[PDB]
C-alpha cells in the first residue's frame, strides 16, 4: 500500500480484454509468471504448454511488446517466440545440437529469446545451489546483484545506454576508464543489439 503507482486488477494473460484494460498499448514490459497448478501434466515438458501458447498468442497480437517469461524446463525456451517460417531460428537448432554433442550444459544459450533476456528457467537456481558447494560466495554474490540482501557500502546493478553522442568512446576499455575516472562504476558486460530482419 505504501509503494507509489502499484495497482492490481483481476484477469489473466489469455483474455485480451483484461490486458487491454490493464493497458498493454502503453506497457513497456509484460511479465508472465506460470501458474502453480499448470505443472500437473504427466509429460514433464508439457507443463509449460499453456504459458508458451498464451505468450505466443500475445506476441502475435502485439509484436513490438516486450514479454518476459519464466519457464520450468530450459529445453522449452526455444518455444518462447516461435517463428516456424524462419531459416535462422532453425539453424540455431543445428547450432544447439552441435553444442549438445560436445557435452555442453549451456546448449539453450544460443536461442534468441534467452539471449535477448526474454526467458529464464529456475534450473539456474539449482545450478547456483550446486555451484555453492564449490563457490560458497556465489549465492551471496547473486543476491547482492539482485539486491535481495542489502549490506551497507555495497553497490547495485545498474545499466547505462550508449547513445550516439558517446561513440567518441570507441572502445569498451575506454568506457571503463571514463567510468572509473568520473563515477567509479565497474561495467560487467554489454547488452548488444543487432538488426536481424526476419
Amino acid at each position: 500500500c505504501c509503494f507509489p503507482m502499484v495497482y492490481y486488477m483481476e484477469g489473466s494473460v489469455d483474455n485480451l480484454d483484461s490486458l487491454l484494460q490493464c493497458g498493454i498499448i502503453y506497457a513497456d514490459n509484460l511479465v508472465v509468471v506460470d501458474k502453480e497448478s499448470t505443472m500437473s501434466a504427466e509429460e514433464d515438458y508439457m507443463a509449460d504448454a499453456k504459458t508458451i501458447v498464451n505468450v505466443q498468442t500475445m506476441f502475435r497480437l502485439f509484436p513490438s511488446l516486450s514479454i518476459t517469461t519464466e519457464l520450468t524446463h530450459p529445453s522449452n525456451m526455444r518455444f518462447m517466440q516461435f517463428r516456424a517460417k524462419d531459416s535462422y531460428s532453425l539453424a540455431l537448432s543445428k547450432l544447439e545440437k552441435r553444442e549438445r554433442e560436445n557435452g555442453s550444459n549451456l546448449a539453450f544459450m544460443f536461442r534468441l529469446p534467452f539471449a535477448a533476456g526474454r526467458v529464464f528457467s529456475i534450473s539456474m537456481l539449482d545450478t547456483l545451489l550446486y555451484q555453492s558447494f564449490v563457490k560458497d560466495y556465489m549465492i551471496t554474490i547473486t543476491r547482492l546483484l539482485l539486491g535481495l540482501d542489502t549490506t551497507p557500502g555495497s553497490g547495485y546493478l545498474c545499466a547505462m545506454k550508449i547513445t550516439e553522442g558517446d561513440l567518441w568512446i570507441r572502445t569498451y576499455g575506454r568506457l571503463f576508464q571514463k567510468l572509473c575516472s568520473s563515477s567509479a562504476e565497474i561495467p560487467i558486460g554489454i547488452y548488444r543489439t543487432e538488426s536481424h530482419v526476419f
Binding site: 514433464d44 550444459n105 549451456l106 534467452f114 535477448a116 537456481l125 545450478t127 545451489l129 564449490v134 554474490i141
Partner: protein
C-alpha cells in the same frame, strides 16, 4: 562325476545291487533337489521386493531433468570427479532415471536409495554422518508449495539432528519459510530470486541471462565454430565466472595493494581482462560489490573477479604474458518520501530504502 551328469564310465557299477542303488539315488536326487531349487527361487523373488567423499541428494520426486542438471553441474569440476552421489527419494525410480543410471558413466557414481530423511535408518544407509554435503531440493512440481516447503524444512531438521556436522544446501520455494532453515550453510529461495531477476530484467534488460551464464560452469568454448561473429563472441564471453582469491596471493591484483579499488579493477581489466566486481575484508564477513574509490586495498582482502578461467588455471595466460617479454583514473581518491516499507511481509525480508507515498 555322476552328480554333474558327466558319467565318465571308467568306474561303473557292474552288479545288480549297486546298479539299483545308483538308480534309486538318481531318482531321489531328481525328486528332492528341485524342491530346494523352487524354495531358493521363491526366496529370490521375495528378496527382489563403495568409496569415501560422497554427496547425498535428498529429494521428494526425482526427474531426469533435475538429475541431469545436478550431474552436469557437479561433475564439471575436476576436484569432484571421485565423488559419488547418493539419492534419497521416498518414491520408486522412474524409467528414464533407470535408463540414465544404467549408463556405465553413471552406474557406479549414482546410488539410489528408496527412503525418507525422517527415518534414521535411511539416513545411515546413505551414510550421512560421513557425507560431504546434503542437498535438500524442493518439489516445484507439487501443486501445494507450502506443503513441499514444510517437507523440506523437516528434511533439513532431520539431517541436522542426525548429522550435525554435514553442510546443508536447502532449496526453499516460499520466502515465509526461509527463516526456518536459516541454520543451513546455503539456502536458495526460488520466489525471491525469480521475482528479483524479473524486476531487474524490467530495469536492466537480460539480467537473468547474465546471472544464468555467470552461475553455469563452462569453458567458454561454445559457438567457436560458428561463422557468425556475434555467436562466437557471445559463446566466448558466456564462459566467464565469478572467482575469489586472496589479494596478496592474486597475481592479477597484488601489484595494486595500497591503491583504490576502482583503479585496481580498471588496470586489472586493462592488463589481463578480469572484472574485479567486489571484495571481502578479512575483519568482516560481508561481501561488498564495488566498495568505491574511497576503499583502499589490503593484502588480506578477498577479491571477487569475473574472468574466463581461474587465476590458478590461468598459468597459461601468465606464461603468455611472460612470453610477451578521457580523464585518467587516480590511484587514490505527488512527491514521494524515501524510507523503508512499514509492514515487511515475512521474516528475513531485507529492508531496502524505497520510494514511498507520504501516506
Amino acid at each position: 562325476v555322476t552328480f554333474s551328469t558327466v558319467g565318465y564310465g571308467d568306474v561303473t557299477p557292474k552288479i545288480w545291487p549297486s546298479q539299483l542303488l545308483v538308480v534309486i539315488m538318481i531318482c531321489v536326487a531328481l525328486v528332492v533337489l528341485p524342491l530346494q531349487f523352487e524354495e531358493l527361487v521363491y526366496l529370490w523373488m521375495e528378496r527382489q521386493k563403495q568409496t569415501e567423499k560422497h554427496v547425498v541428494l535428498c529429494v521428494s520426486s526425482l526427474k531426469i531433468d533435475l538429475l541431469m542438471d545436478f550431474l552436469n553441474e557437479f561433475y564439471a569440476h575436476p576436484r569432484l570427479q571421485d565423488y559419488y552421489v547418493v539419492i534419497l527419494c521416498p518414491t520408486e525410480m522412474d524409467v528414464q532415471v533407470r535408463r540414465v543410471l544404467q549408463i556405465p558413466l553413471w552406474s557406479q557414481r549414482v546410488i539410489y536409495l528408496q527412503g525418507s530423511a525422517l527415518k534414521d535408518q535411511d539416513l545411515m544407509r546413505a551414510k550421512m554422518d560421513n557425507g560431504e554435503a546434503c542437498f535438500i531440493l524442493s518439489s516445484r512440481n507439487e501443486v501445494d508449495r507450502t506443503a513441499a516447503d514444510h517437507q523440506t524444512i523437516l528434511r533439513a531438521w532431520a539431517v541436522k539432528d542426525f548429522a550435525p556436522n554435514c553442510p546443508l544446501y536447502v532449496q526453499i520455494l516460499k520466502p515465509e519459510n526461509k527463516f526456518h532453515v536459516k541454520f543451513a550453510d546455503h539456502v536458495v529461495c526460488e520466489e525471491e530470486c525469480k521475482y528479483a531477476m524479473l524486476a531487474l530484467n524490467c530495469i536492466c534488460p537480460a539480467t537473468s541471462t547474465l546471472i544464468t551464464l555467470l552461475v553455469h560452469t563452462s569453458r567458454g568454448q561454445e559457438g567457436q565454430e560458428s561463422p557468425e561473429q556475434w555467436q562466437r563472441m557471445y559463446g566466448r564471453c558466456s564462459g566467464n565466472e565469478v572467482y575469489h582469491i586472496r589479494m596478496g596471493d592474486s597475481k592479477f591484483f597484488r601489484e595494486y595493494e595500497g591503491k583504490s579499488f576502482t583503479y585496481a579493477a580498471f588496470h586489472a581489466h586493462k592488463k589481463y581482462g578480469v572484472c574485479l566486481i567486489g571484495l571481502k575484508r578479512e575483519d568482516n564477513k560481508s561481501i561488498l560489490l564495488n566498495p568505491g574509490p574511497r576503499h583502499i586495498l589490503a593484502a588480506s582482502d578477498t577479491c571477487f573477479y569475473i574472468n574466463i578461467t581461474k587465476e590458478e588455471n590461468s598459468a597459461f595466460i601468465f606464461k603468455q604474458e611472460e612470453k610477451r617479454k578521457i580523464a585518467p583514473v587516480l590511484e587514490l581518491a505527488v512527491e514521494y518520501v524515501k524510507g523503508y516499507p512499514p509492514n515487511s511481509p515475512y521474516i528475513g525480508s531485507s529492508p531496502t530504502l524505497c520510494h514511498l507515498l507520504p501516506v
